[PDB]
Structure 1
Amino acid sequence: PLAKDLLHPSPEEEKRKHKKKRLVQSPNSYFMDVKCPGCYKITTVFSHAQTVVLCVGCSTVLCQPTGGKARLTEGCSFRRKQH
């Protein structure tokens, strides 16, 4: 197509674009609240944690790093947050 609008893409085709190739840059990662089934405090964990995060008090461990998104241990509920 010739008269393709470059100013206004729909969010469908803007989400699939590469993080650096968007109209304006925006990371694909996020933060989230991870609560152990045992304790009561909620910790903030990066999606791509890149480190082994464990809850304070030496109760259990929270996430295991991988090559992409970090994977959470069994039973740990998470909810992402916005601002």
Structure 2
Amino acid sequence: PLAKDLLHPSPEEEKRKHKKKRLVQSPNSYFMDVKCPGCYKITTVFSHAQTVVLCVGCSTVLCQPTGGKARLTEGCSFRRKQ
């Protein structure tokens, strides 16, 4: 305590903190590139998706809504964007 630099927070404890309580608020979510097991072409998906994302180029269900992060279908791969 006492002499603790609030100007230069450490990255680990900055991620440790709540998203709204950081020096500058940074959301915890991200955008994923989801690849279906059979379809050759990728889809952009929100991590905390609240809707049943359907394959635009097929009938496969890509993710299911949950309390927090959306659950990807088994086999459907994903890569973090940016």
Asked if these proteins are the same fold (TM beyond 0.5), I'd say yes
Give the gaps of 5 or more residues in structure 1.
Answer: none
Query: What is the CA–CA distance in structure 2 between the aligned matches of 1:30 and 1:14, rounded to whole Å?
Result: 17
Give RMSD over aligned pairs.
0.8
Alignment of 1:2-81 (within 5 A): 2-81=2-81
Q: CA deviation at 1:37?
A: 0.8
- Structure 1 runs (4+) deviating above 4 angstroms are none
Report the secondary structure of 2:21's partner residue: coil
More helix by share: 2
Aligned partners of 2:73 and 2:15: how far apart in 1? 28
- 5+ long unaligned stretches in structure 2: none
Task: Tell me the TM-score normalised to structure 1 length.
Answer: 0.95
**1:20-77 CA distance string (max 9 Å, x none):** 0000011000001001011111000000011000101333110000000000000000
Does the residue aligned with 1:6 lie in a helix, a strand or coil? coil
Distance in 2, Cα, partners of 1:58 & 1:50:
20
Equivalent pairs counted in the alignment come to: 82
Question: What TM-score do the two structures reach when normalised by structure 2?
Answer: 0.96
Moved more, 54-63 or 12-21: 54-63
Q: Secondary structure at the match of 2:17?
A: coil
